[PDB]
Write an enzyme that holds these catalytic residues in place. Structure first.
Site, mmCIF file in Angstrom:
data_model
loop_
_atom_site.group_PDB
_atom_site.id
_atom_site.type_symbol
_atom_site.label_atom_id
_atom_site.label_comp_id
_atom_site.label_asym_id
_atom_site.label_seq_id
_atom_site.Cartn_x
_atom_site.Cartn_y
_atom_site.Cartn_z
ATOM 1 N N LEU A 123 19.035 10.274 26.974
ATOM 2 C CA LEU A 123 20.314 10.023 26.314
ATOM 3 C C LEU A 123 21.489 10.037 27.284
ATOM 4 C CD1 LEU A 123 19.784 12.204 23.114
ATOM 5 C CD2 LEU A 123 19.938 9.705 23.119
ATOM 6 N N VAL A 127 19.763 14.850 29.654
ATOM 7 C CA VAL A 127 19.621 15.104 28.229
ATOM 8 C C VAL A 127 18.712 14.056 27.591
ATOM 9 C CG1 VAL A 127 20.898 15.269 26.044
ATOM 10 C CG2 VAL A 127 21.853 16.293 28.108
ATOM 11 N N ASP A 167 35.484 23.985 28.190
ATOM 12 C CA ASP A 167 35.250 22.529 28.346
ATOM 13 C C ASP A 167 35.346 21.825 26.996
ATOM 14 O OD1 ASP A 167 34.806 20.217 29.899
ATOM 15 O OD2 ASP A 167 32.616 20.431 29.823
HETATM 16 O O1 LIG Z 1 23.286 9.404 21.686
HETATM 17 C C1 LIG Z 1 23.617 10.115 22.665
HETATM 18 O O2 LIG Z 1 23.997 9.625 23.754
HETATM 19 C C2 LIG Z 1 23.562 11.607 22.531
HETATM 20 C C3 LIG Z 1 23.155 12.258 21.359
HETATM 21 C C4 LIG Z 1 23.247 13.658 21.656
HETATM 22 C C5 LIG Z 1 22.960 14.746 20.849
HETATM 23 C C6 LIG Z 1 23.152 16.007 21.418
HETATM 24 C C7 LIG Z 1 22.869 17.119 20.615
HETATM 25 C C8 LIG Z 1 23.022 18.423 21.082
HETATM 26 C C9 LIG Z 1 23.469 18.593 22.382
HETATM 27 O O3 LIG Z 1 23.695 19.809 23.083
HETATM 28 C C10 LIG Z 1 24.135 19.446 24.342
HETATM 29 C C11 LIG Z 1 24.474 20.507 25.335
HETATM 30 O O4 LIG Z 1 24.868 20.199 26.483
HETATM 31 O O5 LIG Z 1 24.351 21.687 24.951
HETATM 32 C C12 LIG Z 1 24.207 18.052 24.543
HETATM 33 C C13 LIG Z 1 23.781 17.475 23.292
HETATM 34 C C14 LIG Z 1 23.639 16.162 22.845
HETATM 35 C C15 LIG Z 1 23.920 15.045 23.644
HETATM 36 C C16 LIG Z 1 23.722 13.801 23.040
HETATM 37 O O6 LIG Z 1 23.908 12.480 23.554
#
Ligand SMILES: O=C(O)c1cc2cc3ccc4oc(C(=O)O)cc4c3cc2o1
Length: 329
Positions: free
Chosen positions: A43, A51, A154
Site C-alpha cells: 500500500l 505498509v 505527527d
Molecule cells: O490504500 C492505502 O494506500 C492505505 C490504506 C491504509 C490503511 C491503513 C490502516 C491502518 C494503518 O496504520 C498505519 C500505521 O502507520 O500505524 C498505517 C495504516 C494504513 C495505511 C494505509 O494506506
C-alpha cells in the site's frame, strides 16, 4: 538559557505510573505467528516502514501489516509500547499482533483494517457538519493519548484514517509519538512541515501535548478555508514566515521573548514585519458555507504561537463549534 515550560494538563501522568509503563526500552515484545498473515498488496512505503494489505488466514479478515525498518532502532519498542498502552482508547488504531517478518528479519505490526481511506482524499469535500463531526472524533483520540501521557507529534491528514460509510475515524502511525515527562527536552525534528508548531520552528525543545493542537488547527484551517495546506512553506524557515504573515510578527516576538528564545539570525533577512490578519481575510464564496463565527473562534484558539495558550483537547471538545454535533447516544 531558555525559560522552562510545563504542560498545563496531564503534567505528571507518567511520574505516577509504574516504571514499565513509560520505560519502553525495557519492554519485552510478545511475538505472534507470522504464518497467520498473507500479504496481498503493498500500500505504501514511508521513511521508516513498508505498509501492506494482508489477510489473516485464521479468520479470513483483512488486515494491515506495517514492516518496520527505522534507522533509529529505539523507535521500535517505543511505537510498540505506545500502541499497547493506548489499545482500546477512542479512535486509536488497534495493534492486533506483532510478528517477525521472515524476509526483512524485522518486527511487523499488524493492525485492524480501516477501509480504505484517509481523508486527505475526503477532507477537502466534507460538509460543514461533517468537518465538525470528524474534528470531534479526532479530539477524542487526542484527549485520550494526552491523558495517557503520550503526545502523537505527527497529526496530519494522512494519519487520520476515515471510513466515511460507517462514519468511523482512527488516528494512526504512532511511530513519532513520545511519552511526556515534565522538563524533558525533545527533538524538534518531528511532524510534517506544514503541520509543525512554532515551537519546533524556533527550536524550542521543552514542548508538550499542545504541539498536537497546533497541528490540529492547521488541519481545521485547511478544511474550513479549502486551502491545502493552510501554511505553505517552501522549507522549515519559510514555514515560520508563512505563519507570521497570518498571526503577525509582534505576537511571534512576544512568544520568543516570553521563553527567552533567540531566533536563528537567518530570519533577519526573511521575516519582515507583518500585522495580524483578521480570519475573514481567508473567507470567500467557495468556502463561506464552512465558515461560521464558532469555527473562526475555535480556530483562533488553536492557532496560537504560545503553546501554553492553546486550547487543550478537552477544552476544545467544550467549544460552541461542537454544539450542533449530535453526541452519542
Ligand atoms: O490504500 C492505502 O494506500 C492505505 C490504506 C491504509 C490503511 C491503513 C490502516 C491502518 C494503518 O496504520 C498505519 C500505521 O502507520 O500505524 C498505517 C495504516 C494504513 C495505511 C494505509 O494506506
Amino acid at each position: 538559557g531558555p525559560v522552562p515550560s510545563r504542560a498545563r494538563v496531564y503534567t505528571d501522568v507518567n511520574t505516577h505510573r509504574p516504571r514499565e509503563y513509560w520505560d519502553y526500552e525495557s519492554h519485552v515484545v510478545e511475538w505472534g505467528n507470522q504464518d497467520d498473515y498473507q500479504l496481498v498488496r503493498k500500500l505504501g512505503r514511508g521513511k521508516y516502514s513498508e505498509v501492506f494489505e494482508a489477510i489473516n488466514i485464521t479468520n479470513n479478515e483483512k488486515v494491515v501489516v506495517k514492516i518496520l525498518k527505522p534507522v533509529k532502532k529505539k523507535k521500535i519498542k517505543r511505537e510498540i509500547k505506545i500502541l499497547e498502552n493506548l489499545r482500546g482508547g477512542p479512535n486509536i488504531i488497534t495493534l492486533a499482533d506483532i510478528v517477525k517478518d521472515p524476509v526483512s528479519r524485522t518486527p511487523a505490526l499488524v493492525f485492524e483494517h480501516v477501509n480504505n481511506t484517509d481523508f486527505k482524499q475526503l477532507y477537502q469535500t466534507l460538509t460543514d457538519y461533517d468537518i465538525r463531526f470528524y474534528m470531534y472524533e479526532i479530539l477524542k483520540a487526542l484527549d485520550y493519548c494526552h491523558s495517557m501521557g503520550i503526545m502523537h507529534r505527527d497529526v496530519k491528514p494522512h494519519n487520520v484514517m476515515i471510513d466515511h460509510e460507517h462514519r468511523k475515524l482512527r488516528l494512526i502511525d504512532w511511530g513519532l509519538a513520545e511519552f511526556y515527562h515534565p522538563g524533558q527536552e525533545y527533538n524538534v525534528r518531528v511532524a510534517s512541515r506544514y503541520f509543525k508548531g512554532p515551537e519546533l520552528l524556533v527550536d524550542y525543545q521543552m514542548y508538550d501535548y499542545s504541539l498536537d493542537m497546533w497541528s490540529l488547527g492547521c488541519m481545521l484551517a485547511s478544511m474550513i478555508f479549502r486551502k491545502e495546506p493552510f501554511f505553505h512553506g517552501h522549507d522549515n524557515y519559510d514555514q515560520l514566515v508563512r505563519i507570521a504573515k497570518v498571526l503577525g510578527t509582534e505576537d511571534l516576538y512576544d512568544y520568543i521573548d516570553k521563553y527567552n528564545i533567540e531566533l536563528d539570525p537567518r530570519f533577519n533577512d526573511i521575516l519582515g514585519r507583518h500585522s495580524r490578519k483578521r480570519w475573514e481575510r481567508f473567507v470567500h464564496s467557495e468556502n463561506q458555507h464552512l465558515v461560521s463565527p464558532e469555527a473562526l473562534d475555535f480556530l483562533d484558539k488553536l492557532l496560537r504561537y504560545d503553546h501554553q495558550s492553546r486550547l487543550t483537547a478537552r477544552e476544545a471538545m467544550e467549544h460552541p463549534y461542537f454544539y450542533t454535533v449530535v453526541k452519542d447516544q
